[PDB]
Subunit: 99 residues, 4 copies
């Protein structure tokens, strides 16, 4: 499949297999992402920061590369990582690499 | 409840409860935002600055974090904060973080 | 009246009256913008640089201020201002500030 | 003829003749880009980085200007140049500007 993820009006579309790669995360776990599903529009909706999501999606697309865009402040971006439940392992790697 | 905010063609979506974080602002007060509403398309339309708005919306979503996008000059973002009536406190946090 | 401008897929919406302020420009002149009109979709289409268009739109929305976004290189932006035919004074005022 | 390129839900639109300015690349070659075509939607689909793609399409539109968007890191953008197969000539030149 493909899946549509709507971040505060900005629509993203990715393969189902892209998200299924990390099944423990919010987006990869069918039980966690269902809380954000909108059956009326067949999409997931998040009322959240928009610039961060390119990098959150690239984490999946790249198979594990977590990079903060230069224009997204570290505090904001770290809050999004935790929200999307990328995991402490992932955060670990990211931490060092940043500060 | 969901609300759509169209900034010069750029679509934003959020919840009524998110705008309710700051009820005395333009978007938070029904009386102030009502002149920009379009019942036909079921959205609010502003013929304004596109690159500024994701940070204005994120201010509500974060419960008060106002950060000027790097690509938007100080005086352009200053006018948008003023127009959206974000308040003296938001205007003081803007000043402090910019100089 | 409302006008839709599609820049390589990125849709901008503005009032016809916003474009009407500068009638010697490409977008303000009915005879110049007709070449890029798509009568099927009821929109103007430009197969051009996307990031520069926020500043083009700002020229109209601001009542004639021409400013270069920090992440758009000057050679690219200068080509875009020429193409949209914003004018000599516009460019000269732009030139000066820049240099 | 017009063509729609959907990069992770972000729809870019251009002309066939624009892609044909570099026939040896992925998007310029029918034999390479058809693997990403979506029969049902009449568009190409890439489950790839969004902010990189405006610069990739602009490379075609401009006739060879390849510039990394400030917000996209060097390694991520480099990977995109390779994927879209812009060529060794184009990559060499791109290496010079960053260093």
């Amino acid at each position: 499949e493909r899946v549509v993820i709507n971040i505060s009006g900005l629509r993203f579309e990715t393969q189902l297999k892209t998200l299924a790669q990390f099944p423990e995360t919010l987006l990869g776990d069918p039980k966690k992402r269902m809380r954000y599903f909108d059956p009326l529009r067949n999409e997931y909706f998040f009322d959240r920061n928009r610039p961060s999501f390119d990098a959150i999606l690239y984490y999946y697309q790249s198979g594990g590369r977590l990079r903060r865009p230069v224009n997204v402040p570290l505090d904001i971006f770290s809050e999004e990582i935790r929200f999307y439940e990328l995991g402490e392992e992932a955060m670990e790697m990211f931490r060092e690499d940043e500060g």
